[PDB]
Amino acid sequence: ATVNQLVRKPRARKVAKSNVPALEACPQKRGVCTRVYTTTPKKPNSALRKVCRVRLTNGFEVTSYIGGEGHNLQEHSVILIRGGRVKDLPGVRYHTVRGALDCSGVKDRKQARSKYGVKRPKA
Amino acid sequence: SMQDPIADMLTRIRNGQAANKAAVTMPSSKLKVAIANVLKEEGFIEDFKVEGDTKPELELTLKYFQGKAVVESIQRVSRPGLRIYKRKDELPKVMAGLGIAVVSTSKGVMTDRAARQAGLGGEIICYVA
RNA sequence: GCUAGUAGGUGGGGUAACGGCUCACCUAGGCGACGAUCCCUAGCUGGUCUGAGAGGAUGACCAGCCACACUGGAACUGAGACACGGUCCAGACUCCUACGGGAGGCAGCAGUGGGGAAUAUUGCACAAUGGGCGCAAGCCUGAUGCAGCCAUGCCGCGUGUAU
RNA sequence: CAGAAGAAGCACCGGCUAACUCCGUGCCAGCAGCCGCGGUAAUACGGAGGGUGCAAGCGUUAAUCGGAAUUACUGGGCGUAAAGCGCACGCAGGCGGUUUGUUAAGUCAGAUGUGAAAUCCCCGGGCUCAACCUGGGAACUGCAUCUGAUACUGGCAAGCUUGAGUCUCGUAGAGGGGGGUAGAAUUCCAGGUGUAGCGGUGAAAUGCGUAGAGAUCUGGAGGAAUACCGGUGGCGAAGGCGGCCCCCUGGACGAAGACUGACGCUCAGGUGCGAAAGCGUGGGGAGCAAACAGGAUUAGAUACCCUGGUAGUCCACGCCGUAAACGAUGUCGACUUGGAGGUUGUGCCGGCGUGGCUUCCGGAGCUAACGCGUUAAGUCGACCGCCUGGGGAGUACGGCCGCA
RNA sequence: UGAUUCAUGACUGGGGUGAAGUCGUAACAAGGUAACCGUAGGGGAACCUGCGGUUGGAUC
Numbered sequence: 001a002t003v004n005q006l007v008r009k010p011r012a013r014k015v016a017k018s019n020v021p022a023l024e025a026c027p028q029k030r031g032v033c034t035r036v037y038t039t040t041p042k043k044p045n046s047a048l049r050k051v052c053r054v055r056l057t058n059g060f061e062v063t064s065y066i067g068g069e070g071h072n073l074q075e076h077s078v079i080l081i082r083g084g085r086v087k088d089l090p091g092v093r094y095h096t097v098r099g100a101l102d103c104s105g106v107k108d109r110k111q112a113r114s115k116y117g118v119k120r121p122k123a
Numbered sequence: 124s125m126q127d128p129i130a131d132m133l134t135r136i137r138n139g140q141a142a143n144k145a146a147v148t149m150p151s152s153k154l155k156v157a158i159a160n161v162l163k164e165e166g167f168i169e170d171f172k173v174e175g176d177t178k179p180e181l182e183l184t185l186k187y188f189q190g191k192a193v194v195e196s197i198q199r200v201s202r203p204g205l206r207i208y209k210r211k212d213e214l215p216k217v218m219a220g221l222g223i224a225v226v227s228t229s230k231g232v233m234t235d236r237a238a239r240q241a242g243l244g245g246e247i248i249c250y251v252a
Numbered sequence: 253g254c255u256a257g258u259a260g261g262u263g264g265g266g267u268a269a270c271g272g273c274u275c276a277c278c279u280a281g282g283c284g285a286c287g288a289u290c291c292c293u294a295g296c297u298g299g300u301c302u303g304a305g306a307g308g309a310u311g312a313c314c315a316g317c318c319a320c321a322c323u324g325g326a327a328c329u330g331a332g333a334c335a336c337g338g339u340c341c342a343g344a345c346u347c348c349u350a351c352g353g354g355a356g357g358c359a360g361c362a363g364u365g366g367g368g369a370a371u372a373u374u375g376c377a378c379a380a381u382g383g384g385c386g387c388a389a390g391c392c393u394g395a396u397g398c399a400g401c402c403a404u405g406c407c408g409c410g411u412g413u414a415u
Numbered sequence: 416c417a418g419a420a421g422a423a424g425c426a427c428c429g430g431c432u433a434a435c436u437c438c439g440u441g442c443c444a445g446c447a448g449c450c451g452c453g454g455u456a457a458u459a460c461g462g463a464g465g466g467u468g469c470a471a472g473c474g475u476u477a478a479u480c481g482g483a484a485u486u487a488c489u490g491g492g493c494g495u496a497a498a499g500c501g502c503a504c505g506c507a508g509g510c511g512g513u514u515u516g517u518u519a520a521g522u523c524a525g526a527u528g529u530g531a532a533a534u535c536c537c538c539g540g541g542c543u544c545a546a547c548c549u550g551g552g553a554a555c556u557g558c559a560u561c562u563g564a565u566a567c568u569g570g571c572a573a574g575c576u577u578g579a580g581u582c583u584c585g586u587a588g589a590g591g592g593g594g595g596u597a598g599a600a601u602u603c604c605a606g607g608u609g610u611a612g613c614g615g616u617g618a619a620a621u622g623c624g625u626a627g628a629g630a631u632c633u634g635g636a637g638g639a640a641u642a643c644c645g646g647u648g649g650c651g652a653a654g655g656c657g658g659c660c661c662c663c664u665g666g667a668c669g670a671a672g673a674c675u676g677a678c679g680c681u682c683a684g685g686u687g688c689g690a691a692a693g694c695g696u697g698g699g700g701a702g703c704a705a706a707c708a709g710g711a712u713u714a715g716a717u718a719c720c721c722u723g724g725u726a727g728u729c730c731a732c733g734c735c736g737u738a739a740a741c742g743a744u745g746u747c748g749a750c751u752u753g754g755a756g757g758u759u760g761u762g763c764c765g766g767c768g769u770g771g772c773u774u775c776c777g778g779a780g781c782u783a784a785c786g787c788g789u790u791a792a793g794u795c796g797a798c799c800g801c802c803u804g805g806g807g808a809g810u811a812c813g814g815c816c817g818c819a
Numbered sequence: 820u821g822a823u824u825c826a827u828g829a830c831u832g833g834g835g836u837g838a839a840g841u842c843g844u845a846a847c848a849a850g851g852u853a854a855c856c857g858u859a860g861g862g863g864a865a866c867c868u869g870c871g872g873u874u875g876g877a878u879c
């Protein structure tokens with residue numbers, strides 16, 4: 001583009017959309033589980049992945065992953081969600097924070113405990 | 124149409140050097156002559172002469188060193204579509220000072236080194252390396 | 253496409269002051285693709301973050317400017333206000349009442365409830381700096397100086413040394 | 416004073432990325448920023464031992480810039496990857512050959528005022544050090560005013576002729592608009608001769624024929640298109656233009672001069688032209704032929720094949736405004752080795768030059784490659800149009816235009 | 820009485836994703852009728868046919 005053309009119409013920056021719009025630029029958000037269930041991933045993976053539908057304090061209704069082995073979550077549980085897509089799960093853009101509010105930490109976890117809300121064992 | 128006779132002068136030099144021409148010829152002008160003078164004093168061209176009265180013709184004798192063109196690169200800077208003026212403290216350095224910038228100052232056309240010594244800025248005509 | 257006090261002029265009025273500031277009359281103008289009008293968002297700057305730079309993003313603390321003071325409107329007093337802890341009217345809320353009628357405004361400091369992923373003590377003192385009043389002594393000062401709470405950040409140190 | 420006495424965690428270890436083994440599990444449970452890992456020998460899941468990185472912190476999430484030259488001013492692209500408007504004319508705008516003088520707006524130099532302090536940076540000073548505090552400078556890249564400089568750009572004045580244009584003479588051309596006409600052929604109509612087939616296909620059948628077809632001869636009617644010439648030939652801005660003749664009319668080129676004196680180039684918006692199909696009104700209708708019908712083929716055959724056949728194709732006027740409207744290559748100008756041709760001028764003595772347009776090859780250079788290569792996709796300048804991952808989508812909604 | 824904006828609405832239009840069931844085989848080789856572009860008509864569907872255009876067609 002010539003400078004004459006740029007004087008009339010300057011260069012335009014592309015605005016980027018957030019991959020986590022339901023957080024509304026907050027680091028976490030609290031919600032109430034409306035449904036807890038399992039789902040199967042995309043090809044080429046196979047599993048029964050644990051997710052939940054969670055209505056957030058700002059009115060958004062989204063799906064959130066429940067990481068770790070085993071959980072204590074059911075309908076009406078109050079949880080805290082954070083950013084983080086689950087690659088092989090269609091349209092799951094958020095992770096549940098283990099060890100916050102009504103979500104319990106994972107039992108018997110010994111490594112990466114802080115990622116799953118597990119207190120230090122007394123050994 | 125023709126709208127930059129200076130860029131045409133530089134291109135004739137650039138293309139003539141690439142074609143291993145001994146000399147290039149072009150319609151003359153006082154500004155072209157003033158630029159030819161700087162090219163000669165810096166040893167980039169060998170000589171020049173203006174021939175003719177009502178339609179003067181400028182001829183530049185090109186030089187080659189060891190079978191290679193002496194002008195390694197010659198480039199228009201200020202141009203009709205976008206003029207470039209520099210103050211004395213911001214005159215450009217071509218090839219870390221190994222090349223020249225032809226500057227038009229109020230004391231005439233000279234190199235960037237000469238314009239720095241006279242404490243003048245001006246219009247950056249071209250880089251020569 | 254927009255505009256009739258609209259654009260300009262004359263005269264009167266008005267203001268501390270110039271002015272369509274206002275009124276009467278005359279002219280028919282004025283603004284706009286160098287984006288008017290309309291719509292959405294937004295306090296502005298010194299700066300701050302990033303970047304080799306050019307830029308991009310941003311405007312918390314600190315300092316300058318502006319605007320606001322429960323919501324809408326108004327003036328009075330005064331050198332200065334259309335006035336955060338003044339006045340008047342209207343409105344929504346809370347409260348008192350003998351039912352006629354009255355009272356109030358934390359976006360000052362601390363604090364409570366609420367909302368939220370999330371942000372502190374209903375502390376001490378006018379000793380210092382500064383401000384109001386006073387001839388002064390002094391009185392007032394949640395400005396300010398300090399203390400309490402929180403790994404929130406930056407910086408320093410320790411959690412032993414030698415064998 | 417007393418005694419090591421009170422004081423270490425968090426993430427990670429397949430690759431990017433510093434750090435590897437065993438056991439458990441067996442596309443399960445699970446991990447994940449991405450590539451991906453998990454199917455019975457998992458350095459990728461989970462535990463352990465060992466290791467790596469940070470450390471009173473360490474991880475995760477959110478958010479900004481960076482990397483991203485991935486909006487490219489610095490600093491990118493558009494033949495085929497996304498991208499040149501279908502082609503023009505042209506207002507605003509951008510740009511402007513050459514000489515002299517003048518002006519001093521841009522530009523340049525210097526001065527003065529201002530650019531708050533803090534912050535950043537430099538040299539220091541003070542807290543045991545550092546953070547922090549602080550002195551002095553620099554910086555604040557700007558704005559205004561004054562005084563100078565005059566090369567370049569702009570303004571004003573005067574020129575100049577090389578860009579652009581006018582005139583004179585001629586040349587080639589399917590350039591355009593209007594009218595006329597000719598010959599060949601198809602179809603139809605009439606008549607003569609003549610008799611059992613014709614037509615069609617891969618093979619058939621539908622169809623036509625003893626009510627006399629097909630074939631052959633004569634006469635007539637009518638519409639559409641112009642064999643040969645004909646050519647990687649010509650003309651035109653593009654779309655496009657093909658018998659012959661006349662009338663009206665545009666452009667290009669060449670040779671010698673004369674004339675004007677920068678009158679130029681490009682162009683958002685605007686306006687005009689714009690294949691075929693299609694639309695409106697009125698005509699026309701031979702041949703061809705969407706739709707449609709029948710016969711075949713086939714598993715089916717809403718097709719390809721056959722026999723028919725209506726819009727339409729043709730004319731007048733108006734609309735539509737799109738095409739792989741293509742060289743998938745915007746316009747203008749300058750410059751840079753060669754070879755062989757076509758076509759159309761002109762100079763000179765078949766021979767030698769010199770112009771215009773055009774086809775193929777190929778050098779340097781350029782390009783991701785293919786290729787382009789003096790008709791550039793090479794080397795430069797002026798201006799415009801356009802691109803920014805694939806799909807959704809050139810779609811929806813709104814506007815404008817249109818009879819649709 | 821208008822404008823604009825947000826929410827919502829029986830029903831309806833196409834789109835994306837997943838999954839692969841039913842129907843065919845349009846494209847890629849000359850893809851078995853060269854493909855594609857504009858337009859028009861037709862058809863369960865991919866598509867077919869007419870008219871002009873392109874080579875980004877194989878063979879010759």
Ligand SMILES: [K+]
Nearest residue numbers: 044045046442
């Ligand atoms: K898998």
Ligand SMILES: [K+]
Nearest residue numbers: 257258272273
């Ligand atoms: K007024």
Ligand SMILES: [K+]
Nearest residue numbers: 261262263272
């Ligand atoms: K007046």
Ligand SMILES: [K+]
Nearest residue numbers: 299300310311
């Ligand atoms: K800024």
Ligand SMILES: [K+]
Nearest residue numbers: 320321323324
């Ligand atoms: K208010």
Ligand SMILES: [K+]
Nearest residue numbers: 335336337360
């Ligand atoms: K106050």
Ligand SMILES: [K+]
Nearest residue numbers: 378380382393
């Ligand atoms: K005090």
Ligand SMILES: [K+]
Nearest residue numbers: 439440441455
């Ligand atoms: K095993």
Ligand SMILES: [K+]
Nearest residue numbers: 001487490491
């Ligand atoms: K650029």
Ligand SMILES: [K+]
Nearest residue numbers: 588590664665
């Ligand atoms: K003619």
Ligand SMILES: [K+]
Nearest residue numbers: 500683684685
């Ligand atoms: K245009």
Ligand SMILES: [K+]
Nearest residue numbers: 703704723724
């Ligand atoms: K037919």
Ligand SMILES: [K+]
Nearest residue numbers: 713714715716
């Ligand atoms: K079949």
Ligand SMILES: [K+]
Nearest residue numbers: 700724725726
């Ligand atoms: K017909």
Ligand SMILES: [K+]
Nearest residue numbers: 693735736737
């Ligand atoms: K049309």
Ligand SMILES: [K+]
Nearest residue numbers: 739741742873
């Ligand atoms: K073509």
